[PDB]
Scaffold this motif. Sequence first.
Motif, PDB file in Angstrom:
ATOM      1  N   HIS A  32      42.394  -8.287 -29.221  1.00 46.87           N
ATOM      2  CA  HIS A  32      42.079  -9.296 -28.217  1.00 46.87           C
ATOM      3  C   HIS A  32      43.369  -9.982 -27.741  1.00 46.87           C
ATOM      4  O   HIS A  32      43.521 -10.287 -26.555  1.00 46.87           O
ATOM      5  N   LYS A  39      47.107  -8.602 -19.478  1.00 43.23           N
ATOM      6  CA  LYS A  39      46.513  -9.273 -18.311  1.00 43.23           C
ATOM      7  C   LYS A  39      47.363 -10.434 -17.800  1.00 43.23           C
ATOM      8  O   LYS A  39      47.321 -10.761 -16.617  1.00 43.23           O
ATOM      9  N   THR A  43      49.765 -10.443 -14.423  1.00 39.48           N
ATOM     10  CA  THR A  43      49.548 -11.414 -13.368  1.00 39.48           C
ATOM     11  C   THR A  43      50.859 -12.171 -13.116  1.00 39.48           C
ATOM     12  O   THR A  43      51.099 -12.670 -12.018  1.00 39.48           O
ATOM     13  N   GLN A  46      52.930  -9.748 -10.983  1.00 47.77           N
ATOM     14  CA  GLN A  46      52.292  -9.729  -9.687  1.00 47.77           C
ATOM     15  C   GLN A  46      52.652 -10.978  -8.903  1.00 47.77           C
ATOM     16  O   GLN A  46      53.090 -10.897  -7.759  1.00 47.77           O
ATOM     17  N   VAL A  47      52.466 -12.136  -9.525  1.00 45.23           N
ATOM     18  CA  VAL A  47      52.764 -13.400  -8.881  1.00 45.23           C
ATOM     19  C   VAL A  47      54.244 -13.509  -8.571  1.00 45.23           C
ATOM     20  O   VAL A  47      54.625 -13.887  -7.463  1.00 45.23           O
TER      21      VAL A  47
ATOM     22  N   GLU B   2      50.609 -20.707 -20.692  1.00 43.95           N
ATOM     23  CA  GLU B   2      49.433 -20.155 -21.317  1.00 43.95           C
ATOM     24  C   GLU B   2      49.884 -18.895 -22.047  1.00 43.95           C
ATOM     25  O   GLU B   2      49.617 -18.719 -23.232  1.00 43.95           O
ATOM     26  N   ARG B   5      51.609 -19.375 -25.178  1.00 39.05           N
ATOM     27  CA  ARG B   5      50.687 -19.708 -26.248  1.00 39.05           C
ATOM     28  C   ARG B   5      50.199 -18.423 -26.930  1.00 39.05           C
ATOM     29  O   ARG B   5      50.108 -18.361 -28.164  1.00 39.05           O
ATOM     30  N   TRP B   6      49.878 -17.400 -26.132  1.00 44.09           N
ATOM     31  CA  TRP B   6      49.419 -16.124 -26.682  1.00 44.09           C
ATOM     32  C   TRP B   6      50.525 -15.544 -27.552  1.00 44.09           C
ATOM     33  O   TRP B   6      50.268 -15.086 -28.662  1.00 44.09           O
TER      34      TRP B   6
ATOM     35  N   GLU C  21      39.220 -18.816 -23.643  1.00 41.53           N
ATOM     36  CA  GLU C  21      40.368 -17.954 -23.410  1.00 41.53           C
ATOM     37  C   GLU C  21      39.777 -16.727 -22.726  1.00 41.53           C
ATOM     38  O   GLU C  21      40.252 -16.305 -21.666  1.00 41.53           O
ATOM     39  N   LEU C  24      39.423 -16.803 -19.197  1.00 43.58           N
ATOM     40  CA  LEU C  24      40.620 -16.701 -18.357  1.00 43.58           C
ATOM     41  C   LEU C  24      40.815 -15.237 -18.067  1.00 43.58           C
ATOM     42  O   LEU C  24      41.053 -14.844 -16.931  1.00 43.58           O
ATOM     43  N   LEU C  25      40.718 -14.438 -19.123  1.00 43.44           N
ATOM     44  CA  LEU C  25      40.894 -13.003 -19.012  1.00 43.44           C
ATOM     45  C   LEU C  25      39.927 -12.428 -17.980  1.00 43.44           C
ATOM     46  O   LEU C  25      40.171 -11.366 -17.392  1.00 43.44           O
ATOM     47  N   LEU C  28      41.381 -13.359 -14.100  1.00 40.03           N
ATOM     48  CA  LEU C  28      42.510 -12.480 -13.873  1.00 40.03           C
ATOM     49  C   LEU C  28      42.055 -11.060 -13.554  1.00 40.03           C
ATOM     50  O   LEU C  28      42.750 -10.319 -12.856  1.00 40.03           O
ATOM     51  N   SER C  29      40.895 -10.680 -14.077  1.00 36.67           N
ATOM     52  CA  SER C  29      40.351  -9.348 -13.832  1.00 36.67           C
ATOM     53  C   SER C  29      39.727  -9.239 -12.432  1.00 36.67           C
ATOM     54  O   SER C  29      40.132  -8.384 -11.644  1.00 36.67           O
ATOM     55  N   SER C  32      43.648  -9.453  -9.196  1.00 38.41           N
ATOM     56  CA  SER C  32      44.571  -8.414  -8.706  1.00 38.41           C
ATOM     57  C   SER C  32      44.542  -8.203  -7.183  1.00 38.41           C
ATOM     58  O   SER C  32      44.157  -7.132  -6.711  1.00 38.41           O
ATOM     59  N   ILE C  35      45.503 -13.477  -5.866  1.00 37.06           N
ATOM     60  CA  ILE C  35      45.826 -14.408  -6.948  1.00 37.06           C
ATOM     61  C   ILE C  35      46.114 -15.858  -6.556  1.00 37.06           C
ATOM     62  O   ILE C  35      45.592 -16.776  -7.181  1.00 37.06           O
ATOM     63  N   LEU C  48      42.751 -25.074 -19.264  1.00 40.56           N
ATOM     64  CA  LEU C  48      43.385 -24.925 -20.559  1.00 40.56           C
ATOM     65  C   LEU C  48      44.543 -25.903 -20.730  1.00 40.56           C
ATOM     66  O   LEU C  48      44.612 -26.598 -21.742  1.00 40.56           O
ATOM     67  N   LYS C  49      45.429 -25.973 -19.735  1.00 39.91           N
ATOM     68  CA  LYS C  49      46.568 -26.897 -19.783  1.00 39.91           C
ATOM     69  C   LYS C  49      46.114 -28.282 -20.301  1.00 39.91           C
ATOM     70  O   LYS C  49      46.922 -29.075 -20.795  1.00 39.91           O
TER      71      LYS C  49
END
Lengths: 49, 49, 97
Positions: A32, A39, A43, A46-47, B2, B5-6, C21, C24-25, C28-29, C32, C35, C48-49
């Motif tokens: 996970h 991901k 992103t 991409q950004v 974020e 954090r991961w 969490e 969030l995933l 983002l999916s 693409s 954004i 989250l922040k």
Amino acid sequence: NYVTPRHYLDFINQVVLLINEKRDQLEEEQLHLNIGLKKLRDTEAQVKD
Amino acid sequence: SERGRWEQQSENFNTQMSTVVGDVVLASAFLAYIGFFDQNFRTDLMRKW
Amino acid sequence: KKRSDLLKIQGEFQVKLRILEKSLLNALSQASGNILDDDSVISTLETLKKETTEIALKVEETETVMQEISEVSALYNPMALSCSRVYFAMEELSQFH
């Protein structure tokens, strides 16, 4: 108190069942933690793009 | 932020994944042998391990 | 009271994230492509922040509570000790049937 071979055997069986029980929990969580960093690091490219 | 954090969570899990075998061995003996004794024997036993 | 509840309420910092969490995933999916205006990405994230910060700083105070705990857990120590000693005194009386 007495320690018999039989104890040695259960010892091992516990070590076998707990290493599994523990690794499984950790790997299922590292996976996970990976479906995520990708991901995100994506992103982020991409950004930044 | 974020994603950062991961990264912390990830490294944390590699650490565990890195100390699981020994962590389990120790926890096993505890469950297998320690029981009979008092704190002092448990304590000294856990240290020899 | 504090020590329990407080740290007994790790769920927020647990599930409120352990699944938020996952949320969030998702964004983002279904992303693409556009954004930059994506509300569910701007949301979940900034969400989250915040929901994050709760833990961090609130913890900065729990170490200081563990301190409250310690101070007081030392103030009673001598008495708790006398107690253990008194009991084992009653147990020595056992030499007489």
